[PDB]
Amino acid sequence: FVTDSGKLAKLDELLRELKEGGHRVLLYFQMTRMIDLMEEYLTYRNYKYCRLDGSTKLEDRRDTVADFQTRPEIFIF
Amino acid sequence: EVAQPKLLNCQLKEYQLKGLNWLVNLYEQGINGILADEMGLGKTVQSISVMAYLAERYDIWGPFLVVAPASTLHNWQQEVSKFVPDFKVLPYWGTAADRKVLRKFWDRKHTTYKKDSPFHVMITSYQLVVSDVAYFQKMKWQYMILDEAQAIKSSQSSRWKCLLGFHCRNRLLLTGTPIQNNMQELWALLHFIMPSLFDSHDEFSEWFSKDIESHAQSNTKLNEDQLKRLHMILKPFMLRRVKKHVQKELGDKIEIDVFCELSYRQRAMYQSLRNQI
Amino acid sequence: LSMRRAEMARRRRNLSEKRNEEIKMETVNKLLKKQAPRTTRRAAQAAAAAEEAEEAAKQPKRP
Amino acid sequence: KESYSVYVYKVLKQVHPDTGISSKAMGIMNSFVNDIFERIAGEASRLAHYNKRSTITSREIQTAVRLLLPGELAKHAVSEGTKAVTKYTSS
Amino acid sequence: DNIQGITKPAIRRLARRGGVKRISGLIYEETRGVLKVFLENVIRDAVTYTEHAKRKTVTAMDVVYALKRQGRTLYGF
Amino acid sequence: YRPGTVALREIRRYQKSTELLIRKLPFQRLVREIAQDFKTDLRFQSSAVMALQEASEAYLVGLFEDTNLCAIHAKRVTIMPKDIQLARRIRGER
DNA sequence: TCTCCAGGCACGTGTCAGATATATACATCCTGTGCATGT
DNA sequence: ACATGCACAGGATGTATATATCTGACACGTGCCTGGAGAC
């Protein structure tokens, strides 16, 4: 999976460096289907993440954004 | 050089007070205006400010209509409540039933409201403005703010169609992006603001757009004199201010293009796509 | 008696305006409070689960 | 204000589980129930008064059902009723 | 003279629902007569139940009872 | 469409819909016009007038079916006052 | 007949399947109408 | 000279990704009370 996409392969390198730096990432997509695929990848490399897309209900939005902002364990949104 | 409307239970920053002025003049002289401060400079407070000024001096207390994105209504309602405590806001969102009751607050007989009215500012979404346009069209509005005015960037949008047909003296668009995409979408706003002076998109194209759109799209020469003449035409109707002048404290962004070649599978798919032509 | 009843009808009709105005104004205000007054949560279940886990931890056990 | 709604709903979700029924249709079905009730009960009462009895037993209800409902409808109705009364007696 | 408010088009539509291809022009006034006689019979009974109940308002049940009394049971009320 | 076909189309249109075929306010005014011959100043539940209308339209539609068969028996495709009266005659409404 | 309580009824509530427009781009289908050719 | 057929103009329709809103019907929770059930 991570090598069948050139972007994904390059994102992997960059996220490893970002993590080791203690950076926290908003990661933006134009396709929610891709948001799903990735969701997997992130599980494999075992990084903590949130999700907010047009499916995410309004008070759940508030909740998720507040998390990302409250609890620094989450690395990617 | 006006004074912070005294009905305003806060103090404006410098630029909001210069921006107040602009909107006070754009009224005295009949003009409308886009307030296009770059995103995050405090556009809401300047709008509420104009409305409060109106009241204090001209004793015109209503009705004012704020249309906004649905997501933003509570923020608007709270901001109005904070900055002009005396302003009775009427929320106008809710199920059909909720809205039906609220419609009973609309005084259609008084042309101009005074302090003890049912309501002063009505706050409502673009979606409602369009579904309930039947109702909104009967009312006659003393001022109107569209916030996140990029919502009516298309002249073919039902949203622009509806809102253009509202009887209102005064419109104030708020949007930090008058243009995004074509310049067409700037004509849309200009026509909404002042349909007299920008009465024809085609003229607009011929005289300004096709030059500027070719200078970007095909790297032609930019006609300096034409461009200056456009700015001129825009200048009394659009105010834009930028963070580097008024929110100086933030450090800059670093942008990095990160380049990737297709993997094998990607390529063999890309090329079947190309061969399907 | 008929005159008394006419007077009584004026009384009930006068009272109807006060009774209508009171309910209309109250229900108008209740709805503004229904919408603008608002903002809460629903993960109530999440909170309950957290409380249950805390209660389980409060118990020392060596089985 | 009592209606055989509840029960019409339980029967519906037993025979066509994912299908609903409209409020108007529920009204019509409730009227149907009331009408059939009335007819059967009344014929049963008549049979009782005609045989000088003063009680509407299972046997009155059976004969009412056989007079009222046509052919296969009558037969199947008799069957269901008999089955139900049998189960009741057993319990 | 409200009977002619039952319009020629209204009668035509009802004849169409009843499977009628062509309508002789004398039908319209017969249909009004027939309808008026029928309504009088139902309303007289409905009013009779209404009076008995010591009501001033005719209710849906009064009409349903009047129709059942005349062998034209109406389901739905 | 060739003549007579539009009629069969109209019949189909009216046989597939469930809408009421008499206008509501004309029928309501007829009900009140009849009612005041039996007792003056009668009030009606909104639903009572609709119950009368549904029954009345159902009656007329059923009568037109019987009327149609009377015409067709006489080797006609046109219904006439005679056909209504025979239908009413044999139904025992006379 | 004296006794009990739970099933059902009235009332809120909340949510989500199918529906209302659409920014973001562009290719495509459409057909009014004009021009050319043939009879 | 007139009529018919064939291709430009540029518009409306269309394809695809989520967004931004919404509405009404279904399901579920609450409160309570009367009538279905007990059994002598």
Curated annotation (Swiss-Prot), chain D:
Modified residues (Phosphoserine): S3
Residues with the N6-lactoyllysine modification: K10, K52, K75, K83, K87
Modified residues (N6,N6-dimethyllysine): K24
Quaternary structure annotation from Swiss-Prot or TrEMBL: The nucleosome is a histone octamer containing two molecules each of H2A, H2B, H3 and H4 assembled in one H3-H4 heterotetramer and two H2A-H2B heterodimers. The octamer wraps approximately 147 bp of DNA. Interacts with VRK1; the interaction is mediated by the nucleosome acidic patch, a cluster of negatively charged residues of H2A and H2B forming a cleft within the nucleosome core.
Protein name in the entry: Histone H2B type 1-C/E/F/G/I
Taxonomic source organism: Homo sapiens (Human)
Keywords per UniProt: Acetylation, ADP-ribosylation, Antibiotic, Antimicrobial, Chromosome, DNA-binding, Glycoprotein, Hydroxylation, Isopeptide bond, Methylation, Nucleosome core, Nucleus, Phosphoprotein, Ubl conjugation
Modified residues (N6-glutaryllysine): K1, K10, K13, K75, K83, K87
Residue numbers of PolyADP-ribosyl glutamic acid PTMs: E2
Positions where N6-acetyllysine occurs in the chain: K52
N6-(2-hydroxyisobutyryl)lysine modified-residue sites: K1, K10, K13, K24, K52, K75, K83, K87
Cross-link annotation Glycyl lysine isopeptide (Lys-Gly) (interchain with G-Cter in ubiquitin), location: K1, K87
UniProt-recorded Gene Ontology molecular function terms: DNA binding; identical protein binding; protein heterodimerization activity; structural constituent of chromatin
Function noted in UniProt: Core component of nucleosome. Nucleosomes wrap and compact DNA into chromatin, limiting DNA accessibility to the cellular machineries which require DNA as a template. Histones thereby play a central role in transcription regulation, DNA repair, DNA replication and chromosomal stability. DNA accessibility is regulated via a complex set of post-translational modifications of histones, also called histone code, and nucleosome remodeling.
Gene Ontology CC annotations of this record: cytosol; extracellular exosome; extracellular space; nucleoplasm; nucleosome; nucleus
Entire protein: shown range: 35 to 125 of 126
Swiss-Prot record, chain E:
Result when mutating K8T: In TEBIVANED3; results in early developmental defects when expressed in zebrafish embryos
Location in chain, cross-link Glycyl lysine isopeptide (Lys-Gly) (interchain with G-Cter in ubiquitin): K68
Localization annotation: Nucleus; Chromosome
Positions of modified residues (N6-glutaryllysine): K8, K36, K54, K56, K68
Residues bearing PTM N6-succinyllysine: K8, K54, K56, K68
Protein modification: Acetylated as part of spermatogenesis progression prior to histone-to-protamine exchange.
UniProt name for this protein: Histone H4
Gene source species: Homo sapiens (Human)
Curated annotation (Swiss-Prot), chain F:
Top-level taxon in the UniProt lineage: Eukaryota
Record keyword Ubl conjugation present: yes
Positions of post-translational N6-(beta-hydroxybutyryl)lysine modification: K16, K39, K82
Modification sites for Phosphothreonine: T40, T67
Chain positions found as Phosphoserine: S17, S46
Signal peptide range: none
N6-methyllysine, modified sites: K16, K24, K39, K82
List of residues that carry N6,N6-dimethyllysine: K39
Posttranslational modification: Acetylation is generally linked to gene activation. Acetylation at Lys-82 (H3K122ac) by EP300/p300 plays a central role in chromatin structure: localizes at the surface of the histone octamer and stimulates transcription, possibly by promoting nucleosome instability. H3R2me2a is present at the 3' of genes regardless of their transcription state and is enriched on inactive promoters, while it is absent on active promoters.
List of residues that carry N6,N6,N6-trimethyllysine: K16, K39
N6-glutaryllysine sites (modified residues): K16, K39, K75, K82
GO biological process, one term: nucleosome assembly
Gene Ontology, cellular component aspect: extracellular exosome; extracellular region; nucleoplasm; nucleosome; nucleus
Residues with PTM Phosphotyrosine: Y1
Location within or outside the cell: Nucleus; Chromosome
Positions carrying N6-acetyllysine: K16, K39, K75, K82
General function of this protein: Core component of nucleosome. Nucleosomes wrap and compact DNA into chromatin, limiting DNA accessibility to the cellular machineries which require DNA as a template. Histones thereby play a central role in transcription regulation, DNA repair, DNA replication and chromosomal stability. DNA accessibility is regulated via a complex set of post-translational modifications of histones, also called histone code, and nucleosome remodeling.
Family: Belongs to the histone H3 family.
The name this protein goes by in its record: Histone H3.2
Naturally occurring in which organism (per UniProt): Homo sapiens
